[PDB]
């Protein structure tokens, strides 16, 4: 089975947050629990009744044929929790297995046919993922900031102006909030078109229909790869500056052994009448006091914080004298991509890269040395070697459209030149509903 293929399943909290209220609002019976005594025909009856391919989990060991039915019709099982999930299924294959799941986002549009009750997409989830865990006080701050950008007076908002208790502050957080009638008991009643007004059935994140329309475009812009230019991680490595392209990441050579960085690895140790910052190498446990003579290591550094200066310096020394490759995944940076004539207006010490604050954005520059003309045949030889340490871990130049608009040999293309993408130029056409479209490819 392919990675898309398998048995879809989501945690209850996810189900409750999203699919359930939509089920209530669309007037369908609550989807059935699956005891494992459950017949596949029962599940089909339920998926008929709910107009959604969902079932809630109930109790241990789902029977085989019902499970095969869950797989064939892409029914979304809703697990109370993910612990020991495989025990819940009777896999005759014994092929179902923990850590064989593929976690992924799933748009609500994919499971609901009722288009009116769906506004956003995978995009907003993907953007919430970039966001820090948010205190309610931080949320209020964010809101008030957005307000001041838009010039509104948000004073006393989310507050109580009591005469005797003074001003008080309630939380402004209300993800997926709905207007619902409550019982005098204070508990919520399920929305009833019979008495509650129709405008109330589904608050659309409290936005105008137009703002939702634009919101879709914007979510498409924000999740677009070209705009995403806050790069993560740097690979430190000691090579001659050969490759012209900015997006270069040197390959790790065949003999290297990956080693997760940990404070445990480096230790002060006596060696030849002094206290070398010895590094013991985990495959063999051999201790190497000198930066030189250490085995080729591809040391990943997940967390720069708490690294000793003697140790940061020792790692970089090992990068040079023993040719270590040192990925440093904790760095977030923006990259300007300088042309050869503008050189390197900014310069960075290894010490700064090994000791930047964990949240601050570094600003690296990278040469695109492609537009650099051949040396005169009589220029004096360069005895010494140009050398380079810092590299991107993933591609930069995601924003690039064109490159090297100059001829090579007056006809032949330069290696590394890039023509603009074809999609820049398809002044397509409107769809019958006024959406933009690319021109049809082939026919019809």
């Amino acid at each position: 089975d392919d990675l898309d293929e398998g048995i879809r399943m989501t945690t209850y909290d996810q189900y409750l947050s999203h699919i359930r209220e939509r089920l209530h609002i669309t007037n369908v019976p609550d989807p059935i629990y699956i005891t494992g005594a459950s017949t596949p025909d029962q599940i089909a009856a339920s998926v008929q009744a709910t107009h959604v391919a969902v079932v809630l989990y109930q109790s241990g060991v789902i029977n085989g044929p019902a499970s095969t039915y869950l797989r064939e019709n892409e029914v979304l099982v809703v697990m109370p929790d993910y612990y020991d999930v495989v025990s819940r299924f009777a896999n005759a294959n014994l092929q179902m297995n923990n850590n064989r799941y593929h976690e992924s986002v799933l748009e609500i549009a994919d499971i609901f046919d009722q288009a009116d009750f769906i506004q956003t997409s995978d995009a907003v989830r993907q953007l919430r993922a970039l966001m820090p865990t948010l205190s309610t006080s931080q949320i209020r701050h964010a809101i008030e900031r957005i307000a001041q950008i838009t010039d509104v007076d948000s004073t006393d908002y989310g507050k109580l102006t009591l005469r005797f208790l003074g001003t008080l502050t309630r939380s402004l957080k209300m993800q997926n909030a709905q207007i619902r009638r409550i019982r005098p008991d204070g508990t919520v009643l399920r929305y009833d078109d019979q008495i509650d007004i129709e405008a109330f059935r589904w608050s659309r994140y409290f936005l105008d229909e137009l703002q939702l329309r634009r919101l879709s475009v914007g979510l498409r812009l924000i999740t677009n790869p070209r705009i995403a230019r806050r790069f993560n991680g740097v690979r430190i490595m000691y090579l001659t500056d050969d490759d012209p392209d900015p997006d270069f990441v040197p390959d790790v050579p065949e003999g290297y052994v990956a080693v997760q960085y940990a404070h445990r690895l480096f230790s002060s140790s006596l060696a030849n009448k002094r206290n070398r910052v010895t590094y013991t190498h985990p495959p063999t446990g051999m201790a190497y006091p000198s930066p030189t003579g250490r085995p080729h290591v591809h040391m990943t550094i997940n967390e720069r914080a708490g690294m000793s200066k003697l140790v940061a310096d020792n790692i970089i020394a090992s990068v040079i004298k023993s040719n270590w490759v040192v990925d440093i995944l904790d760095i977030e940076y923006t990259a300007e991509v300088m042309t050869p004539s503008e050189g390197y207006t900014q310069h960075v010490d290894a010490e700064s890269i090994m000791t930047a604050p964990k949240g601050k954005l570094f600003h690296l520059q990278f040469m695109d040395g492609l537009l650099r003309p051949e040396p005169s045949a009589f220029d004096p030889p360069a005895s010494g070697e140009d050398m380079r340490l810092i590299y991107p871990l993933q591609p930069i130049s995601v924003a690039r459209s064109m490159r090297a608009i100059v001829n090579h040999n007056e006809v032949d293309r330069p290696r590394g030149a890039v023509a603009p993408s074809s999609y820049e130029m398809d002044t397509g056409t409107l769809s019958r509903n006024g959406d933009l479209l690319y021109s049809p490819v082939a026919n019809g």
Partner: protein, 197 residues
Amino acid sequence: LSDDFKQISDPKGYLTYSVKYEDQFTKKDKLRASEADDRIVGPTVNLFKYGAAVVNIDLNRDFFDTATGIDLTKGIPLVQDLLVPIGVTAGAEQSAEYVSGLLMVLFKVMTDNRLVIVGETTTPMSNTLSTVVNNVLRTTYHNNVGVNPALLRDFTQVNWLNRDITNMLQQAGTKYGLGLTETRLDYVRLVKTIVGH
């Protein structure tokens, strides 16, 4: 009436080409070209002059202005005091400033109420245009034609570029156009007439 929209002409996009040239390169062979063709193809052939080392597609800084609190100078939106630690000053160059930035992009696009009105427009007489452009042009165009690489066809000295672009445009899957084009909304009234450009 409520001013529900901001009527404007020759609209800003959310994205703009931005280019770096190594200025020592310059083709010896100057390209005298038609006057009317240079007022269409022109802003492009200047934006992608010989020696452009790189052409990027950035957020339009002129649109996502400092008025929205965004700074696009470092290549990502960066908004100053949205997501912040409380009880301490946030510090400079925070990475959260990027996430805040996307919100202010997402916000600013959510509320772009611009409504295009047709701006000043030329109707070149056609014999006055080289055929590659005349095939692209559709009757009329705004004088601020703006930039598009498809315009570089049969104009840029840089041969591989012209060969590859002509190679793209001659495929069925892509077909560039400019200015007035027929649309389902043509002739529709709303005080004035709707048109498609």
